[PDB]
Amino acid sequence: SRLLWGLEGLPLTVSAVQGAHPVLRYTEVFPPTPVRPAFSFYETLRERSSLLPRLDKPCPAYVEPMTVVCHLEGSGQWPQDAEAVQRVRAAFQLRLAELLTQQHGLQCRATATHTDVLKDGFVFRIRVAYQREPQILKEVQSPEGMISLRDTAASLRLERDTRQLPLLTSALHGLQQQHPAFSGVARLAKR
Amino acid sequence: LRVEVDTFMEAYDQKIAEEEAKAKEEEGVPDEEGWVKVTRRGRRPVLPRTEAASLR
């Protein structure tokens, strides 16, 4: 988070970094550990710094990336079209990966919805969200000739993943501070 | 991935620019049968055609 809070070269500055994973709120049943892949256990593409499981060897060790929601500086140059915002977000994924590997030498993979960053043996999944995007998805022009705002399953899903989930993660993170035994009870209940 | 993003935004911006130019041409200019279309491009503020504005 401190690395993001200070990154230079971005067209829009970082405004908020929030975690949305059970690990960051101490509720993961089996906490992860830093890992180092073995070169001979895999085969290598050599076009990208990505490994692939081999057919003869057993299934590789499981690594679960942890979702991080990042909000950029507010601006009025964003498109007012639903599918066009998807294009700008994808461009921000590529730009974020390019700068991160250039300034700090971190392994980054850019995807249309997220960027995977390897740091200190941990894998983080960075998601960039746009503040007015849920409002855009609620725009429904009715046949009679009047445009209104109505909740949509896609719009409701976007509000949960980017706004409601970080709030609960931060709220439960603070609760663990007063009660150290909360982590054990919650993880045992899931098991 | 970068080529497709740049290609789509180039096409999207061209469509937006055409619409703005067409609206700028059509602002004012009463047509036949005497009709003038109320738009936000004028100098007098207008009541938006939204549900929230109507209920307010």
Partner: peptide, 13 residues
Amino acid sequence: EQIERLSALDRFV
């Protein structure tokens, strides 16, 4: 005196 009286992310930057 006579005269006187007469690429995609670049936009975010």
